[PDB]
Design an enzyme around this catalytic site. Structure first.
Site, PDB file in Angstrom:
ATOM      1  N   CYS D 149       0.873  -1.356  -0.106  1.00  0.00           N
ATOM      2  CA  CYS D 149       0.115   0.065   0.035  1.00  0.00           C
ATOM      3  C   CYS D 149       0.948   1.468  -0.052  1.00  0.00           C
ATOM      4  O   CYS D 149       0.735   2.109  -0.638  1.00  0.00           O
ATOM      5  CB  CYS D 149      -1.167   0.001   0.996  1.00  0.00           C
ATOM      6  SG  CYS D 149      -0.027  -0.209   2.821  1.00  0.00           S
ATOM      7  N   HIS D 176       0.081   6.367   9.634  1.00  0.00           N
ATOM      8  CA  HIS D 176      -0.434   5.077   8.984  1.00  0.00           C
ATOM      9  C   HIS D 176      -1.694   4.449   9.926  1.00  0.00           C
ATOM     10  O   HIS D 176      -1.356   4.603  11.191  1.00  0.00           O
ATOM     11  CB  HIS D 176       0.572   3.960   9.022  1.00  0.00           C
ATOM     12  CG  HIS D 176       0.182   3.087   7.814  1.00  0.00           C
ATOM     13  ND1 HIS D 176      -0.903   2.167   8.079  1.00  0.00           N
ATOM     14  CD2 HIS D 176       0.837   2.761   6.607  1.00  0.00           C
ATOM     15  CE1 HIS D 176      -1.107   1.433   6.955  1.00  0.00           C
ATOM     16  NE2 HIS D 176      -0.300   1.724   6.134  1.00  0.00           N
TER      17      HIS D 176
END
Ligand SMILES: O=P(O)(O)OC[C@H](O)CO
Ligand SMILES: O=P(O)(O)OC[C@H](O)CO
Ligand SMILES: O=P(O)(O)OC[C@H](O)CO
Ligand SMILES: O=P(O)(O)OC[C@H](O)CO
Ligand code: NA
Ligand code: NA
Ligand code: NA
Ligand code: NA
Ligand code: NA
Ligand code: NA
Lengths: 330, 330, 330, 330
Positions: D149, D176
């Protein structure tokens, strides 16, 4: 001094360790878990919920030195190999969740311990004792269970209400902090599907360990109470919401007077009483296992009432594990 | 098509606006708040809870163009200056929380509207209506209230249970999402001290009038129900926990069948029914104002049961505000 | 003993009050805010982030008695009416956020105080001071500012790095805890649109002047540093992420040694140093305004490095406000 | 139509499943995991982050029926036994995290599949492809990796900046979202101690999968970029904060013009561009793997700048897994 070994250094094991530091009658002398000593030292030193360890932690030759005292560290999977006798352990705080029957927990006694306290409800008929409910029924058993956090909140409150007004029937809810068995995002929980849903996103209906269990420590209430839980996104501290129908009529002020009297007398240090505008973080670190919230509760009438009591599901329970250790050693 | 003006562009005003886009019988033609049009457009376009607006939003010469339709933007503090007749407004959704009496809300009618729906419980004797409880009692009044989100959850369930089994008495708890009146960290809330404590850190007890208000829309239950709330750190969706004593004995299977039958018939689209392992996020965006959770509830015996019902406190309520607008326009 | 009056009983005012209880050189003798004394007592006694007040709090005839000492409570909106001389106040901690210019803050001196410390960056040319950066430049001014929490983290670190290796240029990000100016769910914030979005649901970009402000307290770095913030859903503790280009090549080990040497010497109690596997909650309650995290930082090469430093944005700043009060009183 | 088998029904497997429903060129025909079909149906139907499945899910004779189409469900631990050929599977989405080398993933090809896409960075030299960085370097390999990702966010942005202005060196941070490998409360994480700390309580420094990897998909940048992560208490959506020193001078407006041009042209659907006041929830569900936030970024000067780009770490990545499947099947 009671010499204590901890089997399992999860949340309960670590907070039992911290609570024992403040007690002169109990000394932790050994910890067993599948963790290196330096990792155990790290988990003791830093805690997201309870802050930094109040003291010094050093690792020397694979063991812990906590406030200058040496703690034997082991990593035995089989409790029969723990050699508790070599460190003079009197009582084991059995805190792995893996040995909740007489047959498994008794391996500690073959390993040299004298007695075992399970830090959760037993899965067989190992007797459970809850302070402020039935400590006085203890009669020399060498393996016992302290039941669960929610039972330690519900049972002392239920006893005071029942003894004074007679509980005909009751239903309870615990609005319960997130625990270690939950998941950070939706993930696998094949025996409890709701329990796998992301814990910080959700209110999660769940079943309660206290529904099966106040009846065991207060037999006069067996069959008269059950309940359930909602897990919510807080990291610690929970609250019992107890709806009871009463045999003897009692105004809310009379119920308050009775709970306050128990909190100030017989149940001091177990049941607490407040009329302040408290919220859950006000009990983070609370040692009482059941703090009655006078202003949060509500009566519909003199025989039908909703009572509210707070508990730090880590600290109260852990302190009462130590109380049970002292109690069975007297 | 009923033309609607929205006074107040807070959570309810904006979710009422979104819900109206999906309905052909109601058209939003004007919004009033102390916000520039471009800030209104931004608040409409992006929503942390419900995602991006489904459609196009443009600002043109101080007004809004949403899905090609022009929406008049004003910033009057006094509703009497709103000139609702100039845009042909039939009904005002009064969503500021500031005009909850007949005298204040009636200024909208002086400004040219025909009727007013308050998006909260009235503070005087303005009649309250809850779909599935008492829409059929509406008698042409020109100012009404849709009660509250929690009342919209409790009353339809309470009605089904009372109609089938007879509620002797009941106490409810709503485990309730964080709302806009709370605080991000401990801050001033001088008329609700607990309510100022940090919303994301705490379980927060809170008073609710919602269970009593059920007595206003269900007079046969007046005096028979009350309850309270716990605010918890989720951003949307709440759950009612209803503890009731029943006159007619009923197994849990019989309660399930009665609720399912109402959800599939008389109360379709108001009361819902599920047997799935749901959690709160599964109702984010739910239009039904009361979704009965069959697996979460528990019966102690045939006359004493704890029932659980979910509601999206933003979406369900907002949709039923539009339902009330259409109902009073028939 | 320096006698201090607090204007504003928000997060900083209350944490400054708690920090002062632990200091013998400073005594709080009066608090001013638009809050009743009993509400002030409640806000002091219970804190979601820092726990229960360590001591006794009593309300008596509209004033506070804290640890036996009487504290005058007032509710003046205009600081010129505060009569600070009647309680012998030496220095005012100006913590309302409302009086950040010389003209407004000077009303405290008209009210009888000798000096004023603003608990935020001044909005005019009132001089700013950060311990470990420029306390030694203080020149007797009677109104000063302690800058901001983030500046107090960045400037001591930036100084050590610049003094040792020469900062060519740097950009910083603070990953910052939720504060009181944010909203619990999407709501109005008309001069900072992102800042109105639901605080517990979002990562929220935000402007910070703090890195530039370093240029005011460290003129040799003026024009060499700027940065921004991300607000995230934690209630306290933030972290600075400083990306700098260095004139003198230095290995990461050499940067560590320089920071450790400053933390153990010239900047002891301001700059801290750790090599542990810490997370934000490990600094909840931290008094150092900048704790360097040796393991978290990363060097791409000998002249380009990312440095990480923690701060408790409530506790560190509040303690250094008291340090500035003592410094200007020498 | 490309027939696809999913190995692993965790977050990525399930969101790949949902994304595939919106694509006519790809059809999921089989899922393998150690979960019963009825539990798989539950996890697909309800999602805390992304809402209810858009369609119908039924279980019949141990398999899934999704939108009327039958999906073969298996629970093989060894991929060599998966018999992909019996369901006509062309490509396997290898999403267990357990088979990240050629030798392990190739067991899918012995089981009858033609090609394999790993949904994480390979642990051997299996080539990685990132759309908008190096899809055009694909040259017929039958086993590939879509990287991670964060790499899918960082690499397309880095490529545009490097191609236009030349990245001399850069350091990155990703703020994150919480993931499934984190813990709900402080618990065991013996190979990443910080990663065991309670996820909803903490900002957690962590290492990044993208630090080792943009150099692999953009070799011209190898050695020129590294970085780290802070895990924070949100359930989804992350943001890259990229600090670069540039070879060619560029004003912030020129950088914006270049990114916008790529987002509107060559990299459309991969790189996005916004000037709105966005926050993380505005990208929950976003398909672009890198959305440049023009207003959040900041330039210190024409050669030293901090760039900000958003990514839904579940949805963007999952959509690009499907893009890679289509790409290697052309
Ligand atoms: O209620 P019990 O049996 O636990 O009694 C314990 C009380 O602390 C007696 O002081
Ligand atoms: O709200 P009730 O229960 O009177 O019934 C609503 C009707 O079924 C439709 O408005
Ligand atoms: O703030 P500085 O760097 O001027 O130094 C502070 C002194 O060491 C003590 O006030
Ligand atoms: O940058 P690449 O090699 O992934 O190229 C893929 C682009 O979508 C070309 O349109
Ligand atoms: Na001890
Ligand atoms: Na063993
Ligand atoms: Na409409
Ligand atoms: Na003091
Ligand atoms: Na498809
Ligand atoms: Na197998």
């Amino acid at each position: 001094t009671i010499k204590v070994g901890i089997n399992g250094f999860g949340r309960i094991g670590r907070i039992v360790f911290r609570a024992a530091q403040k007690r002169s009658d109990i000394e932790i002398v050994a910890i067993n878990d599948l963790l290196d000593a330096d990792y155990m030292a790290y988990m003791l030193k830093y805690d997201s919920t309870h802050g930094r360890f109040d003291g010094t932690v050093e690792v020397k030759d694979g063991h812990l030195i906590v406030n200058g005292k040496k703690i034997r560290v082991t990593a035995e999977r089989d409790p029969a190999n723990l050699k508790w006798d070599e460190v003079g352990v009197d009582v084991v705080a059995e805190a792995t969740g893996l040995f909740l029957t007489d047959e498994t927990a008794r391996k500690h006694i073959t390993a040299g311990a004298k007695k075992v306290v399970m830090t959760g409800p037993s899965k067989d008929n190992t007797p459970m004792f809850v302070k402020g409910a039935n400590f006085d029924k203890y009669a020399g058993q060498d393996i016992v269970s302290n039941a669960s956090c929610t039972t330690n909140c519900l049972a002392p409150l239920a006893k005071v209400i029942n003894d004074n007004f007679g509980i005909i029937e009751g239903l309870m809810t615990t609005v319960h902090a997130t625990t270690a068995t939950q998941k950070t995002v939706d993930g696998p929980s094949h025996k409890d599907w709701r329990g796998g849903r992301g814990a910080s996103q959700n209110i999660i209906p769940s079943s309660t360990g206290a529904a099966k269990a106040v009846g065991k420590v207060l037999p006069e209430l067996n069959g008269k109470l059950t309940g359930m839980a909602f897990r919510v996104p807080t990291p610690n501290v929970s609250v019992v919401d107890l709806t009871v129908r009463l045999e003897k009529a009692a105004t809310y002020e009379q119920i308050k007077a009775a709970v306050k009297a128990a909190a100030e007398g017989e149940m001091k240090g177990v049941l607490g009483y407040t009329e302040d505008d408290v919220v859950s973080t006000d009990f983070n670190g609370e040692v009482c296992t059941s703090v009655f919230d006078a202003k949060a509760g509500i009566a519909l009438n003199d025989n039908f009432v909703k009572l509210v009591s707070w508990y730090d599901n880590e600290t109260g329970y852990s302190n009462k594990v130590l109380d049970l250790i002292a109690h069975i050693s007297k």
